[PDB]
Amino acid sequence: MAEKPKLHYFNARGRMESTRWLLAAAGVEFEEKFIKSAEDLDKLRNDGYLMFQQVPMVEIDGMKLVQTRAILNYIASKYNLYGKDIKERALIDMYIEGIADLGEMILLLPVCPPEEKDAKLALIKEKIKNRYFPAFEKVLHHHGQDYLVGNKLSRADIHLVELLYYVEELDSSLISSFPLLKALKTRISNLPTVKKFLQPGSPRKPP
Amino acid sequence: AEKPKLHYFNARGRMESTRWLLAAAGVEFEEKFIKSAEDLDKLRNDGYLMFQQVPMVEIDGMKLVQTRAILNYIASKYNLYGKDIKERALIDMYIEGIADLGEMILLLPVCPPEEKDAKLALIKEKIKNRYFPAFEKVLHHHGQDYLVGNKLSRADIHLVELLYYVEELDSSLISSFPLLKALKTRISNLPTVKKFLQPGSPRKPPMD
């Protein structure tokens, strides 16, 4: 049915991958429509499906949603992964915008000139070890629960675990002094819908 | 309920959209400005900053960092975030397009004093051929005075703030968009916004 969400993006991770993780974790089946030529982009534009002429775009519930955060916020709410009230959403939002800030740096490394790259990567790795991983370890340490917010699965656990996988590609030792994050990574990775999303053949896009 | 407390530099920066939103909602707030390294160090050493950065807003017993987290909370608390999940989708779509355009403008004075004319020209093209058409199209399709749900929402507030910023950047980009000009005057005459717009308000000055 026109009821499987359709994700429109290039055939890469890029700015669609966190949506791909969130839907998989919510157990939602979806289709992908890949931009592989200028004509794929022109057709979406001409059909009037791109509010600001840009992808990501997700067809969902009769809507043509653009802007990653709008897409993510809607999916999270629809599948009850956005906390139970305004205060839980503020915690989730705080946490995931920190994650998004870090992801944005990693995502913007290739734009750097060939020589800037390593110096900029080294600073990212330092922020992971000294700023971001301590902040999230502290959240889990302080309430003792198996999830970041509300004592249940939320998009914050899913976005964080996604980031732990990307950080592993940078330096597999960055998580080593953070046992609670390692346990979170394992716990979330073993959830049936996520485990299915992580074995080969599933959607999940490569680096 | 005490007044929210806004921790930032004494500048527009990444706190200004929060100032507009609170003022629009008729909410009184305090500001504590960072004017030295000592000010930042104290916030950090006190544990007030999750990721050691500002903006930070003390509100309802939380120490909220990340602009989007701050804005999302305030918008929901004062009924400026639409009436349901699909209205929030439209609002989110709109305001992230606004946020994208604002981020290019904010990141313009970090350009080398040479290739900034190129960046400024790309910005003006996107305003005229991409962003202003998109919002004019939205208003024309439904004819109503507000972006979403015939009701004031953060989307009207964030757009009109951007309209004022575009205007200081270039008086003319709005010329061929009358519904945007119309939205700007209407929102600007709401009592709370009208007050925020007069001199003496917490509205921070530009960066000339």
Residue numbers in the entry:
A (entry chain B): 1 to 207
B (entry chain A): 2 to 209
Please give me the paper's original passages concerning this structure:
The improvement in the catalytic activity of hGSTA1-K141H/S142H as well as its thermal stability prompt us to investigate the structure of this mutant at the atomic level using X-ray crystallography. The mutant was crystallized in two crystal forms with four molecules (1.56 Å resolution) and two molecules (1.87 Å), respectively, in the crystallographic asymmetric unit. Both forms display the typical dimer state found in other GSTs. Residues 212–221 at the C-terminal were not included in the structure because of high disorder. The analysis revealed that each monomer of hGSTA1-K141H/S142H retains the well-established structural features of GSTs, which consist of the presence of two distinct domains. The engineered amino acids are at the surface of the enzyme. The results showed that the mutant hGSTA1-K141H/S142H exhibits higher catalytic efficiency, thermal stability, and sensitivity against α-endosulfan compared to the wild-type enzyme. The double mutation K141H/S142H, according to the crystallographic analysis, results in subtle but specific changes in the protein structure, and the observed stability may be attributed to specific interactions within an amino acid network. The results demonstrate that the mutant hGSTA1-K141H/S142H depicts higher catalytic efficiency and stability than the rest of the mutants studied; the mutation S142H is likely the main contributor. The enhanced stability properties of hGSTA1-K141H/S142H, along with its increased catalytic activity, can make this hGSTA1-1 variant a new potential scaffold for future applications.
